[PDB]
Structure formats: C-alpha cells, structure tokens
Design a protein that fits this description.
Structural class of chain A: alpha/beta
Distance between the termini of chain A: 36 Å
Protein name (chain C): N-acetylneuraminate lyase
Oligomer: homotetramer
Catalytic activity (chain C): aceneuramate = aldehydo-N-acetyl-D-mannosamine + pyruvate
Order of helices and strands of chain A: EHEHEHEHEHHEHEHEHHHH
Helix content of chain A: 40-55%
Radius of gyration of chain A: 18 Å
CATH topology of chain A: TIM Barrel
Shape of chain A: globular
GO molecular function (chain C): N-acetylneuraminate lyase activity
Number of domains of chain A: 1
Strand content of chain A: 5-15%
CATH superfamily of chain A: Aldolase class I
Strand order of the largest sheet of chain A: 1-2-3-4-5-6-7-8
Pfam families (chain C): DHDPS
Family (chain C): Belongs to the DapA family. NanA subfamily.
Largest interface: A-B, 35 and 35 residues
CATH architecture of chain A: Alpha-Beta Barrel
CATH class of chain A: Alpha Beta
C-alpha cells in the first residue's frame, strides 16, 4: 500500500506581496501551472521551496487551503508540517489532514543538536495526534542532520512512516535504503540527479524546478525506466543547464520570474530573501528562449 | 542608558507537559539569576531559553515575565531574531516597548542566505524598532560564519552596538577586539570564559551562569586583576560542571540543578526529552562536589 | 591504445617488515587480468598502499606489475607524491617501462593554492612527456576541484582525463558535458551503475580485484539499457563492498585473494592484519557470492 | 641529567635551491638565528613548517644533522620523525636519537582513514624501535585527524609518550588535557593564540613565526604568566599583525624573506610551493619597518 503516493511533485513556490503576505491569486496560478501545464502528479506543499520556514502558522494554513482548492481530486497532495514548534507541527498536521491531504511530511528537527530518539519521537508524536501517513523530509544540506540505515530501520518500523523525501547526495546510502526497504516510498529531492535517482529505483521525485521544467523531468523518469538511458541523460544535461543557471541567480526568486514570463502573478520572495536581481535578466531571457520555458 | 557590560544569564524556561510556559517557575529562574547568582543581567529568548521551539505569543509571554521578575538596575537584552522577519520586528517592537535595553538577533539560518540578505535583516529590524542591536553569532547552531570584513560592514551601523560571540576562534576574537575597540563583545562560551576575559571581552552570556554565576564572576574578576592562576583553577572547576551537564543534556540538566534549590523547573519543551534519571546519581555527586 | 575500460586498483602484498612480496604481487596482477578479466591495472594508487611506500618500493611495484601482464593490458602509473622530485623520478621511471599514462594525486596536507596544484601537474608533464590523468580522491586528500579548475587543467593537451572519486553526480555530469573528449574513469565501486549512466568511459576499483566480472556486467548492461539487471548486480556488489569496508578493505580484499591460493601477504603497518573475528562472516560472503 | 623540555621553540624553516635541494649553509644560519638572535630555547626540526612532508629521507637526515651541529649543547632539540611510512619514521627516529635529540615527535598518521588503535600502535611501534621519548604532533588543520580526550588518555598512559605539540584551535579540549595530565608536556602550536595558551597553562610553545618574532613571543609568555595580562595581550595584538600579514602572503616563503632581509641565505620554498610574490614586497617592507623585524 505504501506506493500510493508515487509520482512527480512540484515543490510548490509561493508568491508574496511587499509585506511578506501570501498572494492568494498567484498561488492558485502556481498550483494550477504545476498540474495543468507541467502535467505533474501532485503538489508538495509548505516545503523548503515554498519559503515555508519564513512563515507564521496562519500563513501556512492559508497556503494549504489555497493549494488544495486550486486542484482536482486526482491530484496527489503531501503536506509539509514539520517545525521546531511541535505544537505547531501537530496543529498544522491536523489542519492539513482535515482538509484531505494524502500524507504529511516533516523536516528532521534542526538548529538544536537533538538526539536521534528526540528526532524519532517528534515523528511519532505528530503521527499519534494526526493519525495520517508520514514522510520523512531529509535535507541534510539545510538541516545538518544525517539519517543512517540503522536509524531508517527504526523509523520505518512505524507502519505510518511510509517513506522518505530523500535529499542526501549519497547514491551508496540511497541504494542500501532502496534494498533494505523495498516496500517503502522513496521520492528523491535532487532535481539535478533525477536520472541517477531513477535508475536507483526511486518511486518518484519532489522538485522546485519541476514548476518550470516538469515535462523534461517526466521524460527523464520515463525514458530511464524504459532503459532509454542515453536519451534520458541528454535531457538531464539540458535540465542541469536550467538548474545550474537558476541556482547562480537565486533559485526561488528566479523560478518565480520564469513563471511571471508565463503571465503568472509571481509576486516577490519573502524577506530576508531579496527580489530577483535584474543584472541577471538577460541571461535568464536567453535560458527561457533556449529551453522554451 | 546602561552600559551593557557584565555577566548575563541566558534565561532558561520551565514548561509544562504541553509545552506551555510555567510562568511561576520562570519568575523563580529569573530571580535566582539576579538574587542568588548575582548576575548583572538577563539574556532573554536566546537559544538556551528554548526560544526557537516557541510560538510568537509564548515569546512575548517570556519577555513580559522576565521583565516583571527583575528590578530596574538589571540589564536586559531581548533576543528577537527569527526566520520570520515580521515576527522578529513584532517581537522587537514589543520588547522595546517593555523597556529592554537592547535587542539581539540570531543570524538567519536554514536557508543559504547571502551576506547582503543577512545584513539587511539586521538593518530592517533596527529601522522598524529604533533600538540598539547585538549580533547573536552561534556558528555551531546556525552554520553561519561572519568574517572580519562582514563585522566591519555591520558595525558601520550606528545601532549595531556589539556582538554575542559564541565562536571558538581566539584569533578571530582578537582581530575583532582590535578592529572594533568601541563595540560591545560579550562571549558566549562558558567553558572558555577565562580565555575570553584575557582577550578583552566586555562580559559574557551563558546558560551555566544560571547555576555557576559566583565562580563565573570570579573568573571574570580574577583574570582582569591578573590573578590568572586562580582564575584558571576556577575554570577547571567550572569546566568539570559544563562537561557533566553537556553529557547529560544541558538544558534539562541545568533546570534539574535549579529544581534542587526549590525552583519549580518544570520540563523541557518537546521535542527535547526530560532529564534521564539514569543520570540522577552522577548529578547528585556533581551538585555535592561543587556546592551547586 | 585507447584507455577506456575497467581497471583493478592493484593491491600489494607485504611481509611482516612492510617489504613488497614480489611473487604475491605478480599473482595479484595476473589474477586481475586472467581471472577478473579486467582491461588494465592502475598501479601505485591509494589502494596499493602507495602512500606508505618508499621510492624504491614504488619502483619495485611498477616493474613487477608491468612484467606480470602482457602487452595488450592497459597500464596507468600513479606517481603523484607530496615530493615533486620523487613524482618526476617516478613518472620518468614508469614512462621508461612503457606505462600508457601517468596519474597523480592532487597535492594534499599543505594548503597549496590552485595555481600551485596546477603547476605540479604541468611540471610533471613537462619532465615526463607522457599523458596525465588527474587523480581526484577528495575523501583521502581533503582537496576538491571545481568545474572551473578542471577546465584550466583540461586545457592542457597532455591532461587526458580524470580518475573521479568525488561522490557528486551533479559535478560529474557537468564535467562529462563540458569535456566530451576527455577520459573519465570513476573511482567509487559502490556507484558504478550511476557512474556508467552518467557516461564515464570506464572505472578504477580495488574491489574489482575480487569482483571484476560483476563490475563488467554492471558496466555493459547499463549501457545496453538493461538497467534493472545492472542495478541488481549493483545491490549484490554493494553487499560485498559494504562487508569488505566494515572489515578493513585492503587486508580483507587480500584475504579473499588468499582464498584462491594467492600469496596475499600482509598489509603495511600502521594498517593492521585481517582480524580473525571477521573470518566466519567473510567465509559466508565468499560462499554467498562465489568469491 | 636529561633536559627539562619546557620553553619556546622555533619551528625550523629550511632554505632550498632551485631544484628543491637543502641549502645547508642557509639552514645553519636559520638555526643560529633562532637561538642567538631570537633567543629561543630550542629547535623543533622537520615539522610541517620545515616543509618536511615534501622531503625524501636523505633530505630529512640532512636537516637533522645540520640543525644539531648549528647549536650549543644546552639548546633543546625535538626531532619530528613521523611519516606515512613507519619504516621511514623508525629510521629517522633512530637517526635523530643517535644524534642526541632530546625527544622525537610524530604526526598523527593521515591520508588513509586509520583506526585509532592503528594510530596508537604507530606511536608505540616508534617508541619500541627507538627507546626515546615521544611527543604527539597534533595538527588537525593539516592532517584532518582529531584526538579526543579519551584518545589522549590512552596515548598518555604510555610513560614514554611524554606530551603533545598541540597545534589545534580548541581551548575547551586544551583545558581538559591540561587538567587531566598535570604530568605531561604541553607545547602549543598556534602562534596567534599564544597568550590564551599561556594562561591555559601550557609548558611552552613551538612556532614558525618565532623565527622572526621570538622576542615578543617570550614577553607574551613571561608577562601573561606574571599576571601582566593587558601588556601581554597588547603584544599578542602586535604579533598577530605580523602573523595575519605573513599568512596572507604565503607563510613559509614570507618568513624566509624576512630572514633574507637580515643577511641570511634563506633560499626558496620547495615546489609545488611557489616563491615569495614580489607584489607583496612593499607591504612586507612596511611590516618589517613597523615592528623592526
């Protein structure tokens, strides 16, 4: 049953106004873009890419509400509810669950040097008070937390921890996890290594660049699994041009600018993130023309 | 207009089973710091207060309780930094209106913010609050490191009055002391208080000063009176204590030490786990050896 | 020759005094070619306990390895050292023996600047007149090479490729795209399948000393779009790799070789010998995978 | 009557010709400068600052012999013999002991991920083969290896592991080591932190900058020990101006430029180290003038 949530997901980006308030109308357009135009399977809501950790609780609910209203019932929805405030995490978990989100996910607790048992019981406490399926959100590069195979075994021993959004750049640890946990869901989080993740047996992927590059991403995934490896990899080359450029210019503002070119009310990033820098505008215009973004 | 020199307690916070502030116990913790531990001031809503686990209303609640529990002679610094800048500004306005002497803010963490993004977070808070600001630098929790050149650009701001410096680098500390002779430097590593003091710091903020403030003042005073042999010996003893408390879970364990004095020390906030009782004996041995 | 293909990072057997066992070394060399069916030997790399050796022992390893195998066998000589004089002496020595290319570890320990790293490669090249492969092993050296820095290095016509051990598939893909005509040999045995689909030209590995047949099928199947089969042999191969790493890779690999009648000797101290408390577990692995 | 090993040591620099060969006459001058001009207690020979890890065995012996023959019989001499090749370490350990060196030291084995028991028996094997006293050479910034308090206790259990050259930036660990081992020799290795090391109870120090700045170093050490801490710290301010400058310029070639300025044939660095960059000359001359180097 744990493979229900397989597929490609947009890590939903969020447009803000000048005071860091959610632009609800552009958000509806970003959600719709990712399903109708980028033809993806679902939305990963209030993750790192949605600037989620800059938000207050009310804004997070506001994003959850608008994202679900914006899509049809066939669209898969994962609610990222992890927070350093466990009371908040539970509140948001109950909220997203009552709305009908298919699964929750939660960042590994960060900032403080939490012990593994403290990290473990954080997942267990959210599960118990929300009774929803849970996906571990592992982004070592943001959290400084690393999860070993032994720790994954303890976590995966809970029947409601159904899988992981996996972001460690380690394809040895990825393969071991894949072999050790054949029935759990693994969605990879490194857009720039989608093809390698695909051939390592991932069940899908969650990505910020799929908001603008979701159709090449689906081909990478499909071609690689049909053993069209050369063709899959050439698409990874193209995708990585996109990813590398968008990374050099500031990822979330730049992605939202590509969506603006599509006529989306892409608003602004939430301070302390700065708005897209115009010194980049022409290189970005070149990229958009080159890859038809 | 107080100078902000001296020794501060990084205020610990007692919670109930639900993660709610025990207001009664917190008032006790605050007064212990001032009355028993003879400290110059309180550093409020910092990492040791379990601040990053709290909601906005709880942070305000801690600020108000702390301020009400202390006299006017007491120096107060309000840590208002948050990944949500609107919240930081909200909290900055609130603590300022309560009469806190300065704000401080943690360097923005999690996301790989550029330095210019970090700088304008400090500038934006100052300019909505008009209070003096202290850079809260804890590379070990934030993963952010500030260079001499970057302190130079920040200290150029009239309202950035100094730094809470919890980096372990004594070359960098010396360079900063020399480069910025009229800025405030408070050290944040309790276990290197004696090296900090002889490196010319203006004072210190620490969580162990909640239980070991008498020795900490002696290290501070003795090292400056050049009675360094004796100041370092107290550092050996302090560091015995810091070592033990760290191995036991520092915040729960410090509040367990405070329980022993009849303080309503409550719980840590989940996901922090409470004091493990397997440690109870060794802790009793420590409280006993060091008269804690 | 073209230098594409699968190479054994040649292991070296020692006596109790850390002297090279030349008969054992011959048998290891021949085992890699005849039994493991590999294309070449990568000689005096990290896996050969090279950085524990003296200069005359390194010369000894180069001579014995070349003499052990036939003319069709591809031979790469790692001559990099913190001692550039030694690096040059060794590069000349291996070039004179007829090694196909030289390779050289990024200078480490001292915080060399890039320009100092770059001219170390250029200085070895000038003195030897042989083709050079960058030996990039950040986990042992602590040195990382940027795409920018690879570009500067690859401008040199005699810097012909890279033995690539960084566990970073974004950087690997960048390099492959930027340098379609350079030779990329991957260094991580446990990620051969990901490396192969990222378009590497071959691989250098210590575990290929005992698992070269499976490695070849990983390589070949992945390139034929037989991607599930290739991945399955990666699972199998990674069981082996994980086990051997947990026991102490060099002495354990040489212990698997000793099970074939090879005089695999001892590791060089400060490396300790294979620990007997691992023997049953290792025997079970050998049985499981027919090693 | 064997020597008390307390005091201030120059980390001996080595001058090279255009082919990376030792200049013995310059080397003798550098050695005598450290004792007679800089008034230091001892030489630490064939450490990192002597560019030792760039040398062949015959060169290392050249250096041991010349440094020994340059100085009087009261001059303290510590021989760094550690190597990735244990056979070489043993050989040099014997060579240096036969020369009359007061102690050996040995870098923690590096490059390969040796277990700690492997590291330990590396020291115990050198000791057994040489029967001289041994100093742990801990330079984590170069070796990438860290020794914990518990690891120190096990090494220090050996009667012939007599102390540590502690070139490691951690003052909490330094204090623990000091507290646990009142019977062991601690020489600190960070010049820029000599005042902090002094008040933390070290027995002395080994430094490359003491080749040009040993007179200030001694006042820092002596003053701080006598409680005159503000004067000591002011000299740390001054000394760190020199150290920061010399680090910015390329430390070994620059220190050797400073010595060339006093009439010493300080030669060249050994490649891959590049020579002093002339673009730094004016800044260097300004430093020499300011502090009378």
């Amino acid at each position: 049953h744990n493979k229900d949530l397989k597929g490609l997901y947009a890590a939903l980006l969020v447009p803000f106004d000048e005071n860091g308030q959610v632009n609800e109308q552009g958000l509806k357009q970003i959600a719709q873009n990712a399903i109708e135009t980028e033809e993806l399977d679902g939305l990963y809501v209030n993750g790192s890419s949605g600037e989620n950790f800059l938000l207050n609780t009310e804004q997070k609910k506001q994003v959850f509400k608008v994202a679900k209203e914006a899509v049809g019932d066939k669209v898969k929805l994962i609610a990222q509810v992890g927070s350093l405030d466990l009371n908040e995490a539970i509140e948001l978990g109950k909220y997203a669950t009552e709305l009908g989100y298919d699964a929750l996910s939660a960042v590994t607790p960060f900032y403080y040097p939490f012990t593994f048992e403290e990290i473990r019981d954080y997942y267990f406490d959210i599960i118990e008070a929300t009774q929803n399926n849970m996906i571990i959100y592992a982004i070592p590069d943001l959290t400084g937390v690393n999860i070993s195979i032994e720790q994954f075994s303890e976590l995966f021993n809970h029947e409601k921890i159904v899988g992981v959004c996996y972001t460690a750049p380690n394809f040895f640890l990825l393969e071991r996890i894949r072999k050790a946990f054949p029935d759990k869901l693994i969605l990879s989080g490194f857009d720039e290594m989608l093809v390698q993740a695909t051939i390592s047996g991932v069940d899908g992927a969650i990505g910020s660049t799929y908001n603008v590059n979701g159709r090449r991403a689906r081909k990478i995934f499909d071609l690689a699994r049909q053993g069209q490896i050369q063709e899959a990899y050439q698409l990874q080359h193209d995708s990585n041009d996109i990813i590398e450029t968008v990374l050099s210019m500031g990822i979330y503002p730049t992605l939202k600018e590509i969506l603006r070119h599509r006529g989306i009310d892409a608003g602004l990033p939430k301070r302390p993130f700065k708005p897209f820098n115009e010194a980049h505008r022409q290189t970005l215009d070149q990229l958009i023309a080159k890859y038809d973004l």
